[PDB]
Write an enzyme that holds these catalytic residues in place. Structure first.
Site, PDB file in Angstrom:
ATOM      1  N   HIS A  79       0.806  -1.224   0.000  1.00  0.00           N
ATOM      2  CA  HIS A  79       0.000   0.000   0.000  1.00  0.00           C
ATOM      3  C   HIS A  79       0.834   1.267   0.000  1.00  0.00           C
ATOM      4  O   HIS A  79       0.768   2.093   0.930  1.00  0.00           O
ATOM      5  CB  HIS A  79      -0.978  -0.022   1.154  1.00  0.00           C
ATOM      6  CG  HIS A  79      -1.918  -1.195   1.120  1.00  0.00           C
ATOM      7  ND1 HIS A  79      -1.654  -2.355   1.749  1.00  0.00           N
ATOM      8  CD2 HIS A  79      -3.149  -1.362   0.484  1.00  0.00           C
ATOM      9  CE1 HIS A  79      -2.666  -3.222   1.535  1.00  0.00           C
ATOM     10  NE2 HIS A  79      -3.580  -2.616   0.757  1.00  0.00           N
ATOM     11  N   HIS A  83       1.381   1.578  -5.558  1.00  0.00           N
ATOM     12  CA  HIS A  83       0.010   1.059  -5.604  1.00  0.00           C
ATOM     13  C   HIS A  83      -0.923   2.138  -6.101  1.00  0.00           C
ATOM     14  O   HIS A  83      -1.738   1.890  -6.992  1.00  0.00           O
ATOM     15  CB  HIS A  83      -0.406   0.454  -4.246  1.00  0.00           C
ATOM     16  CG  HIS A  83      -1.890   0.122  -4.115  1.00  0.00           C
ATOM     17  ND1 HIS A  83      -2.508  -0.753  -4.913  1.00  0.00           N
ATOM     18  CD2 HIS A  83      -2.860   0.567  -3.197  1.00  0.00           C
ATOM     19  CE1 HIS A  83      -3.810  -0.857  -4.543  1.00  0.00           C
ATOM     20  NE2 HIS A  83      -4.017  -0.047  -3.495  1.00  0.00           N
ATOM     21  N   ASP A 118      -5.376   5.297  -0.684  1.00  0.00           N
ATOM     22  CA  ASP A 118      -4.755   4.621   0.471  1.00  0.00           C
ATOM     23  C   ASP A 118      -3.689   5.524   1.083  1.00  0.00           C
ATOM     24  O   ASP A 118      -2.585   5.071   1.380  1.00  0.00           O
ATOM     25  CB  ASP A 118      -4.112   3.268   0.083  1.00  0.00           C
ATOM     26  CG  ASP A 118      -5.115   2.111  -0.012  1.00  0.00           C
ATOM     27  OD1 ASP A 118      -6.227   2.169   0.577  1.00  0.00           O
ATOM     28  OD2 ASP A 118      -4.769   1.117  -0.696  1.00  0.00           O
ATOM     29  N   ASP A 228      -8.644  -1.209  -7.805  1.00  0.00           N
ATOM     30  CA  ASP A 228      -7.901  -1.537  -6.589  1.00  0.00           C
ATOM     31  C   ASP A 228      -7.127  -2.846  -6.701  1.00  0.00           C
ATOM     32  O   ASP A 228      -6.037  -2.985  -6.128  1.00  0.00           O
ATOM     33  CB  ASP A 228      -8.852  -1.627  -5.401  1.00  0.00           C
ATOM     34  CG  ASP A 228      -8.172  -1.315  -4.083  1.00  0.00           C
ATOM     35  OD1 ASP A 228      -6.920  -1.231  -4.039  1.00  0.00           O
ATOM     36  OD2 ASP A 228      -8.897  -1.140  -3.083  1.00  0.00           O
TER      37      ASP A 228
HETATM   38 MG   LIG Z   1      -7.685   0.336   0.647  1.00  0.00          MG
HETATM   39 ZN   LIG Z   2      -5.977   0.087  -2.105  1.00  0.00          ZN
END
Ligand SMILES: [Mg+2]
Ligand SMILES: [Zn+2]
Ligand SMILES: Cc1cc(C)n2nc(CCc3cc(O)n4nc5ncccc5c4n3)nc2n1
Length: 324
Positions: A79, A83, A118, A228
């Site tokens: 994360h 990402h 995120d 995602d």
């Molecule tokens: Mg997330």
């Molecule tokens: Zn994510």
């Protein structure tokens, strides 16, 4: 409590231009940003520009935002900054291949949303943080991390000279922030299963209406989820690699449970490593395939995403069958 970029950082980004050899490939769903770290912020600006035109945001302001967003991503295994850009790219490719289905406001909102989704992720799960008892679980208690992420974005937007959304009317400003909020909450994987079932339903009865705002929010949500997870849509060696990164995080969480004499579920247990390819297969089957399948139904241009997922799935099968 937010972090700002330096003038060095943001001005160099103003100056950046994408290598022509990358222009072609940026448009492909399977495109991998991995080799070009260096150019990641550059790539987002490009994508914003190619999506929203070259003066949708005041260039000086856009660069400050991006580079700060970068600063507030932690240096965790999965994360992380990378990402965020990967997810933003996938949304770019969805948006381009469905151009007129979505409003200007939506496309700015979502590209920004994905870039921000995120922010300040510590590498610990929503489960964990609640399941024993982090101060953030003390603030929000459903979809903890997400409400944090959204908060972060807002904090970043409300920075001095950082507000890329300024020159909208306060109606439209107050609207995109809604788009950004819902899209970021959507990314809580918990919520996905509900959303998919409804969308499954609605499509199938022929009652899904893109003119209905609440149907709209749901498709977007599915889009968010589809973006995602898109690592599962890259060519096999890319995906294999990413997997290592997602496991590195989980296992570290499991270590912190073990350290307090608590058995972590097998997924975050580095002592259960062989079970991994079987872990993946399960995930593709219960979560991934269903996700992309319904998105290809709603948005037929998003078909290659589904195709790539299938191809990865069979690789995992072959690993389990002992052929890799
Ligand atoms: Mg997330
Ligand atoms: Zn994510
Ligand atoms: C890109 C991406 C994104 C997300 C959210 N996930 N989540 C997963 C977990 C898959 C999974 C589920 C599960 O129950 N187990 N059990 C296991 N036992 C052993 C080894 C792996 C296991 C496993 N692996 N992989 C992801 N990849």
């Amino acid at each position: 409590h937010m972090s700002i970029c330096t003038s060095e950082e943001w001005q160099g980004l103003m100056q950046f231009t994408l290598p022509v050899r990358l222009c072609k490939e940026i448009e492909l769903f399977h495109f991998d940003i991995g080799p070009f770290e260096n150019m990641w912020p550059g790539i987002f600006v490009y994508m914003v520009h190619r999506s929203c035109g070259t003066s949708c945001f005041e260039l000086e302001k856009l660069c400050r935002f991006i580079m700060s967003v970068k600063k507030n991503y932690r240096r965790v295994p999965y994360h992380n900054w990378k990402h965020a850009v990967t997810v933003a790219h996938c949304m770019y490719a969805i948006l381009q291949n469905n151009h007129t289905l979505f409003t200007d406001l939506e496309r700015k909102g979502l590209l920004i949303a994905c870039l921000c989704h995120d922010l300040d992720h510590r590498g610990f799960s929503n489960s964990y943080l609640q399941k024993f008892d982090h101060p953030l679980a003390a603030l929000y208690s459903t979809s903890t991390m997400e409400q944090h992420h959204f908060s972060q974005t807002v904090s970043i937007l409300q920075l001095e000279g950082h507000n890329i959304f300024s020159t909208l009317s306060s109606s439209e400003y107050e609207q995109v922030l809604e788009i950004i909020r819902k899209a970021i909450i959507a990314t809580d994987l918990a919520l996905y299963f509900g959303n998919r079932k409804q969308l499954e339903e609605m499509y199938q009865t022929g009652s899904l209406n893109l003119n209905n705002q609440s149907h709209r929010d749901r498709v977007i949500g599915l889009m968010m989820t589809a973006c995602d997870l898109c690592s599962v849509t890259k060519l096999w060696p890319v995906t294999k690699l990413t997997a290592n990164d997602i496991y590195a995080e989980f296992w570290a969480e499991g270590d912190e449970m073990k350290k307090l004499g608590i058995q972590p579920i097998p997924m975050m247990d580095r002592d259960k490593k062989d079970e991994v390819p079987q872990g993946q297969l399960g995930f593709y089957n219960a979560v991934a395939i269903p996700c992309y399948t319904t998105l290809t139904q709603i948005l037929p241009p998003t078909e290659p995403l589904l195709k790539a997922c299938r191809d990865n799935l069979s690789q995992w099968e072959k690993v389990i069958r002992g052929e890799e």
